[PDB]
Design a protein around this nucleic acid. Structure first.
Lengths: 134, 90, 106, 185, 70
RNA sequence: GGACAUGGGUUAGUCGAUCCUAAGAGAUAGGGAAGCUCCGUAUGAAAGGCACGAUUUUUCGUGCCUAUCGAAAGGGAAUCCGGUUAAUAUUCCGGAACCAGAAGGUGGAAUCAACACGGCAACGUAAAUGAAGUUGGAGACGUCGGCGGGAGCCCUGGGAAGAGUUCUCUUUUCUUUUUAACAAACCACACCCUGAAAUCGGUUUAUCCGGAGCUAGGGUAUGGUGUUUGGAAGAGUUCAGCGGCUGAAUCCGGUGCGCUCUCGACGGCCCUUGAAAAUCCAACGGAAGUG
RNA sequence: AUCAACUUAGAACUGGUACGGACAAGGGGAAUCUGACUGUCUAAUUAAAACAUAGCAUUGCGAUGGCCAGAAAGUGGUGUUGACGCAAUGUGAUU
């Protein structure tokens, strides 16, 4: 039960290795296309750059832009953490069909981006948005 | 039993003397024996060179410093215990 | 029939590596070939890396970028298992230094 | 899967298939089968069970494909908002690549007789193109836009999902996400 | 050293300025081999039908220097 | 006649040298020594760079951290076939390639969500920016012992061309039956996923492996001296005719404790553990940015 | 069912009892002296019982040092060393 919607986890395998993601929906029972206990997540690919009080507003926006990604990941490849992210506006947007039709996948990516942008500006989940160094 | 007494030393044949070959026998069975890895428990530790003991366990791959012929020596074990008791006292 | 070295180097060495061909003129001939390449090895575990060809050092310069690496963090420098250990050990020790700091701050 | 109705049986003609299979089509002149994978379009001859031709679409994702009745032309509708015209005697690369659609392209349909074809996407707009083909080698096929059908609603980020051609005349059957079937005459 | 399975692209490389000559080969097994000398590679095309070969030959631009079997 | 006399003859971006460093030689700094010269090789040396900035009192400020020689058997960019000469050829000729560097141009991709997507994954893709600084890898390594694969040679069953023998016997004896670099597609020990294993099982010529996840089912990677074509039959070879020219044939298969070289997976040995550098690649990091 | 490889056993028959038919290819034993052994040397009269060796033992030295070098030097070796080490010797496996 420690893999719940709203829980921050780390992707340990795949292209996005070491990226912090939020559990968007858990299908631990399995599925026909994914016979294992997978969980769809939304995370960050390009973390926003560090900002300085001396920086002008245009660069502050320029560095604060964040590139998200949505992915279904195996439980064994996810590393759950104690941190939790409040996924407001992000409760119902992901479904098996949303992955089947990429137009819903593209819409989900855009909504995930705008939510991550606003949350970053709000200054919440500082650990979630800082890159993990390894 | 192919050889009743000589053992691994049968390769040396009749040369070098009986006593000068028996001590090699004890040292050589120690040197070529397989030892249980302290980190993975698998019986996969084998001598590489004099003092080097490498574990070929997939996922362990740990190298160790030890005796020339055996992984752990009495002198090293005594030193480890005395240093442990000194540190605990200190 | 018998063959001779094409170059002026006798004394088969590592650089004097040869192959037998039969030509369109029905001739048994040596072909002087180069040494074989090596798959890049992992930096931490030393295992050869997966997804990269086995080429000589300079012959790596002709490849495309994606043909010499793997799309992952440290990809093309560390194996997948090595990277996974890097990630989990990094996160776990970071949580410790946080919990040690919270312990010592009070 | 290939299903033989006369024998009432089913089978898989591929010993090993590379990539996820997105769509399938039958060739109209020579007994070939077209497999539209994630990125590649592969032509397989069924009678000898071998790979005929490979088409490099140069596209991240392929959605649907259609075949000209002459059998030497293929349209690739892609999720990359792109239409790729493949001419089998032209090159392995797409002969033409078109990016008029502003959203992901869903389906492409060729009229079985007339030299007209259409692309339906999720933007709600249907692109009607005239694709003229001569068998003469000197004359490359003429691909030209003809109409931009608009005024179709988009529901849940889903627009024109399926388009079909009339077997005889230039009539278009377009199905939307709202349950509306439009007749473009 | 470059086998071409596409008629058009063989024609286009023939029209391309790098092309210098074309050659015709008539094998005993009755297939026609259209070889096109270019600057860097030699592009050859094998055709199994005589009339397709003939219509291809007349499809070559006149300026190209075509040579029969050597 | 390797004698004697007169002439002729050695063609390279790809083969070597050149480049790299080895053991070692060796100037400079310094110190000795009457001196010839000796010792010395990052040493008791001020031993050289790099970037920012309206231009800074129009007299420059601010930061940032090792010679050389020495290998025609070591390391190492990239060439093959056929032919030609009285004598040269991986060098010339005909054909066919390759590498390194340079510049802009065509086409394609990414981009105002600046720096692509897919796969659970191992990883894949025709592309997919990355300064300084750091780090990893290749170069780059002993020896013996079998075992497996490949190529060439050897052996062999038919076919076809000539030739040998034939008093007798021999559907036979012999020769020939060839395919280069390079380009393209294809081709399963490590690893991933599902799974939970004692009636313990898998497995090798050689007993190693497994709850640190076996067997098994499905994948990923490595991809040549393998295969199918291109090269390429027009060449080479054999044979039958004509006065340089014209006809044919060059085909289809088997085998192995076989030899030569190589390759893969292992095994043993050592108080013996078996070069360096040039060069090349990749990564962490994120300077910077109609065009 | 057909296909492919030479390795052994046994039966007869047969020949001036011949038979690894040429080639190729150990003489063997009972003991003494001596060096343990493999190895090394007087190139061009001495290959040994000599030298070496493992093993044994002794000696010097803890670095401001032992041993060795240089005319001298802000010099060199052991030494990328540290007593399970380096240096100097005598004996010469084992019992």
């Amino acid at each position: 039960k420690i893999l719940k919607p709203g829980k921050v986890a780390l992707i340990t395998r795949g292209r996005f290795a070491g990226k912090k993601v939020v559990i968007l929906q858990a299908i631990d029972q399995g599925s026909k296309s994914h016979p294992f206990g997978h969980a769809v997540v939304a995370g960050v690919e390009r973390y926003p750059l560090k900002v300085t009080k001396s920086m002008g507003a245009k660069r502050i926006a320029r560095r604060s832009r964040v590139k998200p990604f949505i992915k279904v990941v195996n439980y064994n490849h996810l590393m759950p953490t104690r941190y939790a992210l409040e996924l407001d506006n992000l409760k119902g947007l992901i479904t098996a069909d949303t992955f089947k039709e990429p137009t819903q996948r593209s819409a989900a990516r855009k909504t995930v981006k705008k939510t991550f942008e606003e949350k970053y500006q709000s200054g919440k989940s500082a650990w979630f948005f800082t890159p993990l160094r390894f | 039993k192919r050889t009743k007494k000589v053992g691994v030393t049968g390769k040396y044949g009749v040369r070098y003397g009986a006593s000068l070959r028996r001590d090699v026998r004890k040292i050589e069975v120690q040197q070529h024996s397989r030892y249980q890895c302290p980190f993975c428990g698998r019986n996969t530790v084998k001598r590489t060179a004099a003092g080097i003991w490498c574990c070929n366990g997939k996922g362990c791959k740990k190298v160790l410093a030890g005796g020339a012929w055996t992984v752990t020596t009495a002198a090293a074990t005594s030193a480890r215990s005395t240093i442990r008791r000194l540190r605990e006292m200190v | 029939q018998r063959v001779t070295y094409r170059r002026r180097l006798a004394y088969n060495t590592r650089s004097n590596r040869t192959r037998i061909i039969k030509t369109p003129g029905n001739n048994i001939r040596y072909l002087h070939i180069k040494k074989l390449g090596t798959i890049p090895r992992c930096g931490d575990t030393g295992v050869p890396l997966q997804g990269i060809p086995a080429l000589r050092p300079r012959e790596f310069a002709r490849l495309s970028h994606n043909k010499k690496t793997v799309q992952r963090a440290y990809g093309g420098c560390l194996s997948a298992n090595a990277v996974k250990d890097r990630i989990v050990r990094a996160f776990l020790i970071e949580e410790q230094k946080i919990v040690k700091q919270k312990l010592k701050q009070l | 899967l290939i299903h033989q109705l006369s024998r009432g049986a089913s089978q898989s003609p591929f010993s090993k298939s590379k990539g996820s299979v997105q769509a399938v089509t039958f060739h109209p002149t020579m007994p070939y089968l077209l497999v539209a994978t994630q990125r590649y379009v592969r032509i397989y001859n069924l009678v000898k069970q071998e790979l005929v031709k490979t088409l490099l679409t140069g596209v991240k994702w392929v959605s649907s494909l259609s075949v000209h009745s002459s059998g030497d032309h293929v349209i690739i509708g892609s999720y990359d908002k792109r239409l790729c015209w493949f001419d089998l005697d032209f090159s392995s690369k797409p002969y033409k690549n078109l990016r008029y659609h502003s959203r992901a392209l869903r389906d492409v349909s060729y009229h079985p007789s007339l030299p007209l074809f259409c692309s339906g996407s999720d933007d709600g707009d249907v692109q009607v193109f005239h694709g003229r083909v001569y068998s003469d080698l000197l004359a490359n096929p003429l691909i030209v836009p003809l109409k931009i059908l608009r005024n179709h609603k988009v529901v849940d980020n889903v627009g024109v999902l399926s388009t079909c051609w009339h077997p005889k005349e230039a009539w278009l059957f377009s199905a939307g996400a709202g349950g509306e079937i439009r007749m473009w005459t | 050293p470059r086998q071409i399975s596409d008629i058009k692209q063989f024609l286009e490389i023939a029209r391309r300025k790098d092309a210098t000559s074309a050659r015709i080969k008539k094998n005993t097994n009755k297939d026609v081999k259209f070889k096109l000398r270019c600057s860097k590679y030699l592009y050859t095309l094998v055709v199994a039908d005589a009339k397709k070969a003939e219509k291809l030959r007349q499809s070559l631009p006149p300026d190209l220097t075509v040579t029969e079997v050597g």
